[PDB]
Amino acid sequence: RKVLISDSLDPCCRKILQDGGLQVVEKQNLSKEELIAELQDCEGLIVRSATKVTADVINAAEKLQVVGRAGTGVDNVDLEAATRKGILVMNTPNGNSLSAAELTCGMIMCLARQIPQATASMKDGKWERKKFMGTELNGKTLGILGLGRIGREVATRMQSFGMKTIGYDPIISPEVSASFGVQQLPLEEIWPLCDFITVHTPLLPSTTGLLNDNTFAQCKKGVRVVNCARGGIVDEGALLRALQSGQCAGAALDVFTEEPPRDRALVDHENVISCPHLGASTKEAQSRCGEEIAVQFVDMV
Amino acid sequence: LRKVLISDSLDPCCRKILQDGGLQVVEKQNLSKEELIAELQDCEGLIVRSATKVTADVINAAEKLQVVGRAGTGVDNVDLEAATRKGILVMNTPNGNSLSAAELTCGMIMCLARQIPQATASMKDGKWERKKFMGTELNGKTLGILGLGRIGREVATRMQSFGMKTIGYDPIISPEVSASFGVQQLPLEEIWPLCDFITVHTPLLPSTTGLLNDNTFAQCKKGVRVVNCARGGIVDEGALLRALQSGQCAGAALDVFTEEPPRDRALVDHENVISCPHLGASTKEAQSRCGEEIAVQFVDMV
Ligand SMILES: NC(=O)c1ccc[n+]([C@@H]2O[C@H](COP(=O)([O-])OP(=O)(O)OC[C@H]3O[C@@H](n4cnc5c(N)ncnc54)[C@H](O)[C@@H]3O)[C@@H](O)[C@H]2O)c1
Numbered sequence: 001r002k003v004l005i006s007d008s009l010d011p012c013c014r015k016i017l018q019d020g021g022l023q024v025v026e027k028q029n030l031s032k033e034e035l036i037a038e039l040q041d042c043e044g045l046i047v048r049s050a051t052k053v054t055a056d057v058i059n060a061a062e063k064l065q066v067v068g069r070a071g072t073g074v075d076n077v078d079l080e081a082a083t084r085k086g087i088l089v090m091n092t093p094n095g096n097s098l099s100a101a102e103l104t105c106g107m108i109m110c111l112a113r114q115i116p117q118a119t120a121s122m123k124d125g126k127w128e129r130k131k132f133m134g135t136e137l138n139g140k141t142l143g144i145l146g147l148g149r150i151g152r153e154v155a156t157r158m159q160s161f162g163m164k165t166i167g168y169d170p171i172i173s174p175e176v177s178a179s180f181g182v183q184q185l186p187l188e189e190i191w192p193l194c195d196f197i198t199v200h201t202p203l204l205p206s207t208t209g210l211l212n213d214n215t216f217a218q219c220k221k222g223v224r225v226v227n228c229a230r231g232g233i234v235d236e237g238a239l240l241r242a243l244q245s246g247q248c249a250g251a252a253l254d255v256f257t258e259e260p261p262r263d264r265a266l267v268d269h270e271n272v273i274s275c276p277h278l279g280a281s282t283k284e285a286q287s288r289c290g291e292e293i294a295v296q297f298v299d300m301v
Numbered sequence: 302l303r304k305v306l307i308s309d310s311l312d313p314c315c316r317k318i319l320q321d322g323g324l325q326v327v328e329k330q331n332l333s334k335e336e337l338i339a340e341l342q343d344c345e346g347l348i349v350r351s352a353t354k355v356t357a358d359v360i361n362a363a364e365k366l367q368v369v370g371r372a373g374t375g376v377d378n379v380d381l382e383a384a385t386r387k388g389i390l391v392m393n394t395p396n397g398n399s400l401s402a403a404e405l406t407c408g409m410i411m412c413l414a415r416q417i418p419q420a421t422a423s424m425k426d427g428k429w430e431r432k433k434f435m436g437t438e439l440n441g442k443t444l445g446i447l448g449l450g451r452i453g454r455e456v457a458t459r460m461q462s463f464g465m466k467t468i469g470y471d472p473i474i475s476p477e478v479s480a481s482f483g484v485q486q487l488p489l490e491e492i493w494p495l496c497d498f499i500t501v502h503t504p505l506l507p508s509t510t511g512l513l514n515d516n517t518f519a520q521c522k523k524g525v526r527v528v529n530c531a532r533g534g535i536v537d538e539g540a541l542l543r544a545l546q547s548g549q550c551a552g553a554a555l556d557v558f559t560e561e562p563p564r565d566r567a568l569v570d571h572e573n574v575i576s577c578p579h580l581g582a583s584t585k586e587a588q589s590r591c592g593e594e595i596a597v598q599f600v601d602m603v
């Protein structure tokens with residue numbers, strides 16, 4: 001059939017599809033009405049995160065058969081509406097892991113030394129040595145919640161800095177985590193030990209507010225936290241209260257409960273470092289995800 | 302060997318160690334030239350960090366002064382020539398800062414790969430600009446490390462954990478020794494074309510002033526990224542600006558400048574440059590270690 005790529009993807013996605021004999025239309029930044037119009041001659045749609053595959057789009061897209069997302073999860077696809085119609089939804093759980101792990105490590109280093117703030121200071125003409133006294137990562141404890149693809153890659157990188165890496169994952173055995181140097185403990189034992197906490201779980205009811213007022217209360221005063229997973233795993237209201245009291249000394253956020261976020265209190269806080277969901281924003285990750293999704297479209301004979 | 306003036310803001314452990322060694326200590330900070338010379342009247346020892354400027358005039362007016370200690374690397378704020386001519390010993394702390402400087406360098410590499418400082422600035426300006434901040438994955442990329450001493454080797458082993466190939470050069474470290482911490486030595490001319498990132502960890506010497514310059518930038522890959530958390534002037538600042546302006550250099554991270562604070566703002570102002578006010582040693586841990594390291598030398602002196 002014919003596939004529309006409605007967001008900006010690596011050009012290899014397009015190449016692999018055509019090599020498989022498919023018509024492609026590559027057209028970014030479509031309005032809701034433009035998207036529906038294009039799709040009515042299309043059985044495939046491929047998105048990244050910008051296009052919102054809502055029930056209304058799906059319902060109006062009568063010939064649609066498969067929606068592919070070139071990223072993890074299905075955050076911008078109404079999976080329930082797609083399933084109600086006969087529509088397959090596919091994604092790319094492997095292609096961007098390494099890039100996400102690397103950003104998470106960068107964010108830890110940025111929290112330790114306040115590099116983003118120091119650059120902003122310098123650009124205002126300031127030379128603020130005292131303000132930007134930091135902390136050394138060597139000897140500190142990093143808590144890693146979620147020890148799948150990304151969590152284990154964060155662990156081995158941060159171990160090279162001399163960090164003690166502890167963590168928790170309901171599915172990963174202690175024996176598997178020991179093989180990448182992560183000691184598992186129950187959550188209640190993790191909180192008071194950590195200098196830094198990073199989350200690498202899916203977003204589920206059980207992981208929403210994984211860090212919240214109750215768990216911040218149990219942390220070491222001055223804990224630094226990273227969320228490069230999904231918005232909401234760290235409760236944003238709790239995080240702001242923790243930053244306000246000094247219970248959390250800083251946070252680094254790639255992701256938000258709303259993207260772009262309309263509430264600016266966290267982004268605007270002096271001790272918060274942020275990015276516009278750049279975890280998979282590398283040429284390499286994008287090349288890998290574009291291939292991953294294209295191959296899945298070709299493999300359906 | 303009796304009274305020591307500590308003239309800059311140091312970790313309190315420096316004072317205690319001197320005092321345990323059996324020395325008198327005066328902590329006074331932010332002194333003018335005249336004030337510094339007056340405090341030194343009864344002092345045979347002076348301990349500084351970076352702000353106090355132990356110039357030829359101070360050295361020559363300070364009558365009982367026998368040793369100057371700097372709680373940091375090199376002798377940037379001490380006229381060592383003047384000191385040596387008058388017979389005054391100068392001591393510094395070559396070990397205490399290594400790990401904090403290595404960590405900052407690695408943080409700078411990550412920031413250049415993913416534009417985290419620029420991304421934060423954009424978000425704080427109320428923007429959501431994903432495409433602009435498309436970055437580079439470190440795995441498989443080549444990092445060139447010039448200077449393979451205390452800091453170079455620590456940077457190498459950390460960036461190796463990211464899957465970077467670490468190559469470099471040091472005139473005194475043998476290829477066999479550098480091999481033992483995973484750094485492949487090659488001649489400089491073979492390095493430039495191979496590097497995705499270059500980081501410098503040398504002293505500032507005639508051999509290292511302008512080690513990166515217009516000619517070496519022309520030998521590099523289009524889009525090379527450069528880090529200087531060592532000393533200002535190892536990367537020629539004019540050459541670096543020209544390379545940033547043409548795109549030969551995709552970005553640079555600078556902790557150090559030929560003038561500090563720098564009066565010329567062109568590099569700091571460039572959108573592809575990330576910077577810090579010489580924070581390589583600016584951690585609680587490093588400052589503690591340096592404070593200990595310099596007081597301990599003074600006490601052995603007794
Ligand atoms: N910021 C980005 O651009 C970016 C990029 C890629 C992935 N991600 C996100 O990062 C997260 C991790 O991705 P991954 O590829 O490593 O996923 P993965 O499935 O390999 O691993 C996730 C792990 O989380 C664990 N988990 C579930 N509930 C948990 C809980 N309550 N406590 C601790 N662990 C729990 C699972 O057991 C699993 O092992 C996901 O949310 C993913 O969407 C973000």
Ligand SMILES: NC(=O)c1ccc[n+]([C@@H]2O[C@H](COP(=O)([O-])OP(=O)(O)OC[C@H]3O[C@@H](n4cnc5c(N)ncnc54)[C@H](O)[C@@H]3O)[C@@H](O)[C@H]2O)c1
Nearest residue numbers: 374398402448450451452471473502503504530531581582
């Ligand atoms: N930004 C900061 O706050 C900060 C903090 C600590 C140290 N430093 C600086 O970082 C630099 C490295 O310090 P270190 O402790 O690793 O020093 P080190 O003495 O242990 O190592 C320096 C190495 O540079 C090498 N070298 C000399 N000339 C060279 C050349 N032409 N090419 C390649 N290598 C050359 C030497 O042979 C030596 O092995 C110094 O300039 C030091 O002052 C900066």
